[PDB]
Amino acid sequence: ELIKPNWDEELPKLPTFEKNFYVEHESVRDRSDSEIAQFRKENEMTISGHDIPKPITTFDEAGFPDYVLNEVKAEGFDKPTGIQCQGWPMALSGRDMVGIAATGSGKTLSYCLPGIVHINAQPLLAPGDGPIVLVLAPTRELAVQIQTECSKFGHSSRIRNTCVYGGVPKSQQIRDLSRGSEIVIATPGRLIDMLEIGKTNLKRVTYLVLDEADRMLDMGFEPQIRKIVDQIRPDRQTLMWSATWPKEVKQLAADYLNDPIQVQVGSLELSASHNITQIVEVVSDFEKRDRLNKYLETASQDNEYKTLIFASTKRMCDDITKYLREDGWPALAIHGDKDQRERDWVLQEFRNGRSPIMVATDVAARGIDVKGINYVINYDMPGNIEDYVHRIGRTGRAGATGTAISFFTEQNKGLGAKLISIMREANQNIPPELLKYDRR
């Protein structure tokens, strides 16, 4: 079962790997130190640690070999993600890292591409051997996300992966751990039920990634995790990602890392309460009024519904309500352009049922508590994401259920990426062709 070796007696008998692969093109050093400090805090990165690499700013600037540099731009993307631009240099250079970013961030390429480079510097699997890079994820869905990126970027080489997670045939995973995987992704539960049968082993693990560490401990995989990391040689490179910062994540990082850099990209992320169902639809500005009515009537048969509509201009809450009451919707517009005299009986006739549907702007969305709002509808997609979550937050907290409908178009491109990271935080269904903003 357990037994936890002494890493002074078995360690100097173990072979020894190299884990630095970064060239640090002189394009990046120097730029410097007013614009890499401007770049760093424009992605709201907050780094700390010793000897922290300057971020790259294009694919060529990351010291990637070509069999993966070619396939990383072949995705048709310019100027790789912020998390990729500070993460790839420290990962390729073999340091350990604790990264703070929201659940759903563009984190998995951060460490899978340097992992691929980490493998093809090392002897082959030499039958009897187990994985080189080991990734631990809480959920099956993230584990398969990760393996999609590991076979996409691994195909160029022999790199073979097999993720072992729970709720699937436990002998077609004995048959996949049988067959020399260089990458093994595992929920910690099933990794321990394959390590007592001894169908796999971690004594060639040199590169460890704990993804979504915080919600790995939430579901109490901490016992499991702690007794898989003991089994791994302590001169490994170790990368750990977390959205929150509990006392135990703080200690998990303390126990199982070694001189790590601390990168925080996110903003200590916010609830987007899970009582709300979220409906996004990729549409044009043109056909958008058409789909207003479809959902307006889907909500407008249940009494007493109360919908809240948002649009970008305040001029386009008049044209939206002049349209909406012209075929008999009890719709009133709220905004500061006119008459704040008669702006606050729209709400004395909103929390009763006199006019269930009220249309307003983000600037107009100012400190009013009319909660009871059902089926809130973003006609015009906002420019930041801290407003989207402030928009949709007014439904379903007492009556802890509600719906949110968003009309997403191409003039929200820069918000596509961040928006998906708010849905997988809340384990919500994602439109099949909103997903094309997933990373970068």
Numbering used by the authors: 57 to 496
Task: Reproduce text from the manuscript describing this model.
This molecule fragment composed of NTE-RecA1 is likely generated by the limited proteolysis of the linker between the RecA1 and RecA2 domains. In the crystal structure of Dbp2-apo, two RecA-like domains adopted an open state, with the NTE subdomain located on the exterior surface of RecA1 and the CTE subdomain inserted between two RecA-like domains. To estimate the position and intrinsic mobility of the two RecA-like domains, we calculated the distance between the centers of mass of the RecA1 and RecA2. This distance was 42.9 Å in the open state, showing that the two domains were far apart, as shown in Figure 2B. The RecA1, RecA2, NTE, CTE subdomains, and linker form an interaction network, stabilizing the conformation. Residues R495 and R496 of the CTE form five hydrogen bonds with V128, E131, and T137 of the Q motif in the RecA1 domain (black box). We solved the first crystal structure of Dbp2 to date, illustrating that the protein is rigid and in an open state. In contrast, the CTE has two conformations: one in which Dbp2-apo is wedged between the helicase core and one in which the addition of ADP induces it to move out of the way of the ATP binding site.
Human DDX5 and its yeast ortholog Dbp2 are ATP-dependent RNA helicases that play a key role in normal cell processes, cancer development, and viral infection. Similar to other DEAD-box proteins, DDX5/Dbp2 is composed of two RecA-like domains that include 11 conserved motifs. The helicase core of Dbp2 consists of two RecA-like domains (RecA1: aa 101–319; RecA2: aa 332–465), an NTE (aa 53–100), a CTE (aa 466–496), and a linker (aa 320–331). Here, we report the first X-ray crystal structures of the Dbp2 helicase core alone and in complex with ADP at 3.22 Å and 3.05 Å resolutions, respectively.
